[PDB]
Write a protein that binds this ligand. Structure first.
Ligand SMILES: *[C@@]1(=O)C(=O)N([C])C2=C1[C]=C(S(=O)(=O)N1[C][C][C][C]1[C]OC1=[C][C]=[C][C]=[C]1)[C]=[C]2
Lengths: 145, 93
């Protein structure tokens, strides 16, 4: 063959990768949080977009901090051998480091950890992508005109 | 032989750390609105980080919050690309 560079991920596996989208809209009276509106458009949008990107989209609505974790633990346990990647979209309320299940908070590290190079063997060397639509605190960018 | 276990992860944050993340009750969130726009327009042209950078300017320059409440009125937002990837990323091939 010829010189072999490799500055880009092998994205020609039989499958582009499964894309998980968690669409939390409604929260338990207790959390003291209001429902997010508009999120259903967001969620529909990503599905259409990732569907065009040959991604195997799985929308998961209003998940509890517990179901998010099981979902992840379970999805991470899957065999991603014939897949080029993994996308995961978390649509919800948040704070630096955490995103809220419908009943409580989940640590971004707690879930993205199921996919660490040593805990998700069939994804090691492959790009794990996490898109996050949630607050990372409560600061406001008054911007500069 | 070995590689970081936190290696090959990409974090696309809708906002800079500590700030609010805007969402419009009708059209959706600024971020995902702008993320889907850019993906369909370039997923087959640009490398992922170049896409997300267009996504950053779309949000930054095109959106600005309207609100009856001074506190939340006229705010901007800048998504945050956090990459621990070790190679370029093109959804096409
Ligand atoms: C943010 O995601 C979060 O974690 N929390 C508690 C929260 C967040 C964003 C929003 S918002 O997108 O609605 N918006 C941006 C900051 C203030 C707020 C103002 O407008 C608004 C209020 C109620 C419904 C819809 C829009 C809210 C809460």
């Amino acid at each position: 063959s010829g010189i072999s560079l490799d500055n880009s991920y092998k994205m020609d596996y039989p499958e582009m990768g499964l894309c998980i989208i968690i669409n939390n809209k409604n929260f338990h009276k207790s959390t003291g949080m209001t429902s997010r509106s508009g999120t259903d458009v967001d969620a529909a949008n990503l599905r259409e977009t990732f569907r065009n990107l040959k991604y195997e989209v799985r929308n998961k609505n209003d998940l509890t901090r517990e179901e998010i974790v099981e979902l992840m633990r379970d999805v991470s346990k899957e065999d991603h051998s014939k897949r080029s990647s993994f996308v995961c979209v978390l649509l919800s309320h948040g704070e630096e480091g955490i995103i809220f299940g419908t009943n409580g908070p989940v640590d971004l590290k707690k879930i993205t950890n199921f996919f660490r190079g040593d805990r998700c063997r069939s994804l090691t060397g492959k790009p794990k992508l996490f898109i996050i639509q949630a607050c990372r605190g409560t600061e406001l960018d008054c911007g500069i005109e | 032989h070995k590689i970081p276990v936190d290696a090959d992860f990409l974090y696309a944050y809708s906002t800079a750390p500590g700030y609010y993340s805007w969402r419009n009750s009708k059209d959706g969130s600024w971020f995902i609105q702008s993320l889907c726009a850019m993906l369909k327009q370039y997923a087959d042209k640009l490398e992922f980080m170049h896409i997300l950078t267009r996504v950053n300017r779309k949000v930054a320059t095109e959106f600005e919050s309207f609100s009856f409440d001074a506190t939340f009125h006229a705010k901007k937002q800048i998504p945050c690309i956090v990459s621990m990837l070790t190679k370029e990323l093109y959804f096409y091939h």
